[PDB]
Design a protein around this ligand. Structure first.
Ligand SMILES: CCNc1cc2oc3c/c(=[NH+]\CC)c(C)cc-3c(-c3ccccc3C(=O)OCC)c2cc1C
Ligand SMILES: CCNc1cc2oc3c/c(=[NH+]\CC)c(C)cc-3c(-c3ccccc3C(=O)OCC)c2cc1C
Lengths: 572, 572
């Protein structure tokens, strides 16, 4: 029942059965031919006794090794290679989700967990497929075949004295559990001691201040003493643990192998059957670890499959929206948008705003306010619940999010560089037209070409795998350039010039505002220095808009102290 | 040669040889009796042929197990418990050093490294002593005895074909190295892939904004496919590693054990000799892993001893030196004092300041310019290569200045809550609590108890481990009270945080200013609150110190063009 989702997930990558079935059958044949080795060995002993049959068999035996290896080789590869083909394409699908699926909010839950999914659960499924399931089948067949060979081989006598040994050795596991618990409490006490010293030593200043060492050291004398006491206990426990694993195992060997002594002394004709029995003893000892590891790993594998099937669900609606792109220079309206992230949690409520075409709009409010949510709903990253975004004849619901977001240029305060060469950011967003080498003039109108004219190579200027060898205030110029050179329709900025120290601020403004002041702008602001240039300001508080109009008129009308106090406190 | 420091370090805790020698002898006897076991197992097998004498001797084996384990217990216990007696004592010594030894600058180098040195490194030494050296001796004795027994037991025939097996199996180790290298490069490429996705996924806002998923997805296709390619390679390598092991070992078995078959078919009287040999086989395979682990761990253990002896070196000798501290109220003069960290990097240079019996003395300056070092220089955390400090030249530094430390009223950001209660802080002050019967009403006089009157118990009130549940100002006031209640002759203060500015600072200021109306103080807290609380200033720049009088004349002379910068920066 629970394996049906896993089988379906494997079926998602269909190139599986045709060679996987052959690989599994090949491994079964490998196990079967492996079970015939000790039978050949048991005939070889009698041949060596006399001589010539021994030479001939020593040969044949060699053969039944190499094929047993050789075939097995072509077995595991035919599995293992296919295992990668099972994983790779699977990752493919997951990637085809984890970039197409995530509407921004879905990716705001946990980026680290999501990235760890497609790098750990894939490995877990690979281990389950390539080794663990084949190991399970191989171990099951090997164990049952060895048992049946020992039944038909003897009079269920040596087999009986063998199978009795695990029954008595079952008592060994509780000793192991006791040792594990004692050891674990030992490291627990060690961690407590380490915490005590990591609390005392960093505060050595106060200890030295009042010559208190005579008592502080005293505490340490307690600490180690506790450890010592605990140590004594484990030693005593180890005194009863150490020999016991050594003891019973001795008996176990003497219980079984020496038992075969009868069979080779006077009981039966077991001279070579004894070496065959020892070979089968190794044959059965080998796969127990594999079988128990598979039985343990099955739960982790099914959990990984559950996370995969959870992630694979749902899909974005870029094409589902439609295709109604046009001049897209109409004024924007917000009407009674009332939602945050949940229907019950109303971060925003009953908001209406007007933004005229070609008019600069800025947003001011507290950090805990709805400024960020307002910005993300303007960029349509959040699906509206009840409020309406208004353009000519209500086209936003069918305004081709691909094309609508194409018309939008974006820039943020963080300005994080996408790692790689500078050519990545140079050509990013220029899809459907490489435009040849006109990028240089687009850069120079943005005042970035002259700045970057330090010019190591213009394409080998790699920001690095971590993207760290560039100033934080540097990416603003290239971001403005890339926004302007393809999408000069509407731009959105999020406090990208707060910390440029009024020197890079002027440098980036004399490009941006000079080149694109004729287009619609939406701005999230942190300072009054950038809102004076804005024709319209919107003040957010308590999840509601309470400020409309020009900076001075709104400031005198309703902004007043409600904004002076906050802005000066930020200044202070 | 290199083991001489380790032997000396063990000798530092002398309760060692008397029982360790007996434990080693008992372990050797255990090895001998274990080696004797398989010889007994042969006669019992000729006896299993005989029947009666076999039952009687099958007995004796039981005894020679219960002794073999039994004595071994009293061996390992005597080796283990007594072993702890070293480590505990060793830690003892370390603690007796790690509090007496460290002058403040010695502790400034590292804190977590030292607790690692005193816990994990002691654990390594314990693992060397209690098990690894006994493991080495046991393995050597067992291997030599097994070889000698097989020599005197099988004349150059079975032993030779046995020892040939490791010679051929030596080729396995290069295969293991190849597999390990391939696997390691596999996780390296996996880590590279994880880094790529950790670069990309957090940037999903920008990725979606420019609707470039179509190309970004391509990058993912470049990633997994590479892994797939690499995976294919390792699979091929795995195809040539898996069976080969299962070949080379298995042939080995039939190379030797099947060989023993001839010895029991027509060779000679090997019926019980075969089972004795197969049992010696495990008896010799066991200690190989132990001897290898000991050889690997010897280097780590000798490094452990090196770190131990490095830590134990040198000791702070101010404890006994010095005498005749009676008044602690004569004028103090600093003159010609210059020291940083090394004779070529003097942070401080030829400075002189006078405090006399004045009310206060405040140090002002840029961060790192000398404010932080003078605070500890006055109260002797560092011993400078500097001029004399005229307190009579502290009687030419002949005061018992370790005992003079019972004059500090150290103030800081604090939160140095050692142990876990307020009564723990009381116990911390047990230096001279012979009059502890009357100190709590002094705390009432110290104005603290009224604030502490919100007491849950006040006799066992837990401050929480690491002290993360108390207000900062609460620790401020309680520390001030605990300092002043006995030894208020000298006050140390250094404040760098102003989170709870108004209430906490005003309360502590009024309380202290009431509570040292007749004592000299040293304070470095802030620009202007400090001076309106203290009314005297000193200023340090580039090491050099200057100041004479109250704030106003210092500003008129020195602060006219320098201190306004600090005022504006702190106002920001
Ligand atoms: C005092 C002299 N002999 C000491 C002798 C010992 O003899 C052993 C022989 C063995 N071979 C014959 C079947 C095996 C497998 C384990 C043995 C143990 C042993 C017991 C418990 C855990 C580990 C071992 C151990 O060393 O690990 C082996 C997996 C053992 C242990 C000690 C301390
Ligand atoms: C392709 C089918 N799956 C496998 C089948 C295997 O057959 C093995 C059979 C013996 N067989 C008796 C004929 C031994 C000793 C190891 C075997 C190994 C083996 C090889 C290298 C290292 C460890 C083992 C292993 O499991 O550890 C034991 C040393 C092994 C491993 C796998 C994955």
């Amino acid at each position: 029942s629970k394996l049906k989702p896993f089988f379906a997930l494997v079926r998602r990558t269909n190139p599986s059965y045709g060679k996987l079935a052959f690989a599994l059958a090949l491994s079964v044949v490998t196990t079967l031919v492996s079970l015939l080795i000790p039978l050949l060995t048991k005939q070889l002993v009698d041949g060596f006794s006399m001589s010539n049959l021994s030479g001939t068999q020593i040969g044949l035996i060699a053969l039944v090794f190499f094929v047993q290896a050789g075939l097995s080789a072509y077995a595991t590869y035919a599995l293992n290679y296919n295992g990668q083909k099972i994983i790779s394409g699977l990752r493919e699908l997951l990637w085809k989700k984890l970039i197409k699926l995530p509407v921004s909010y879905f990716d705001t839950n946990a980026s680290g967990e999501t990235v760890s999914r497609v790098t750990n659960d894939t490995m877990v499924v690979k281990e389950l497929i390539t080794t663990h399931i084949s190991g399970f089948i191989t171990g099951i067949i090997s164990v049952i075949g060895s048992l049946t060979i020992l039944f038909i081989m003897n009079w269920k006598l040596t087999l009986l004295v063998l199978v009795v040994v695990p029954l008595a050795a079952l008592i060994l596991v509780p000793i192991g559990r006791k040792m594990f618990s004692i050891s674990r409490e030992t490291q627990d006490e060690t961690a407590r001691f380490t915490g005590l010293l990591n609390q005392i030593l960093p505060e050595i200043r106060l200890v030295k201040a009042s010559n208190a060492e005579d008592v502080e050291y005293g505490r340490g004398k307690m600490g180690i003493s506790s450890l010592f006491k605990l140590g004594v206990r484990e030693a005593k426990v180890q005194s009863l643990v150490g020999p016991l694993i050594s003891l019973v195992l001795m008996a176990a060997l003497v219980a079984v192998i020496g038992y075969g002594g009868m069979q080779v002394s006077s009981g039966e004709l077991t001279a070579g059957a004894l070496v065959a029995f020892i070979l089968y003893l190794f044959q059965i000892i080998m796969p127990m670890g594999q079988i128990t590891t598979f039985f343990t790993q099955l739960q982790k594998s099914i959990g990984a499959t559950e996370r995969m099937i959870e992630i694979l669900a749902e899909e974005e609606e870029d094409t589902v929206t439609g295709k109604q792109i046009e001049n897209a220079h109409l004024p924007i309206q917000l009407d009674r948008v009332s939602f945050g992230y949940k229907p019950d949690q109303l971060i925003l409520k009953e908001v209406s705003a007007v933004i005229e075409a070609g008019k600069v709009t800025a947003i001011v409010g507290p950090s805990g306010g709805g400024k960020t949510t307002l910005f993300k709903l303007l960029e349509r990253f959040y699906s509206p619940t009840a409020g309406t975004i208004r353009l000519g004849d209500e086209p936003v619901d069918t305004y081709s999010l691909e094309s609508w977001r194409e018309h939008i240029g974006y820039v943020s305060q963080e300005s994080p560089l996408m790692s790689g060469t500078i050519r990545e950011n140079i050509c990013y967003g220029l899809e459907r037209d490489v435009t040849d080498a006109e990028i240089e003039k687009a850069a120079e109108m943005a005042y970035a070409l002259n700045f970057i004219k330090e010019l190591p190579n213009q394409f080998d200027t790699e920001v690095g795998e971590r993207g760290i060898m560039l100033s934080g205030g540097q990416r603003q110029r290239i971001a403005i350039a890339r926004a302007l050179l393809r999408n000069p329709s509407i731009l959105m900025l999020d406090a990208a010039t707060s910390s440029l120290d009024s020197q890079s601020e002027k440098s980036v403004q004399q490009a941006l505002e000079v080149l694109m002041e004729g287009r619609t702008t939406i701005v999230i602001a942190h300072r009054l220095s950038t809102v004076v240039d804005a024709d319209q300001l919107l003040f957010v508080e308590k999840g509601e808009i309470t400020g409309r109009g020009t900076h001075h008129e709104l400031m005198a009308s309703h902004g007043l102290y409600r904004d002076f106090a906050e802005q000066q406190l930020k200044m202070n």
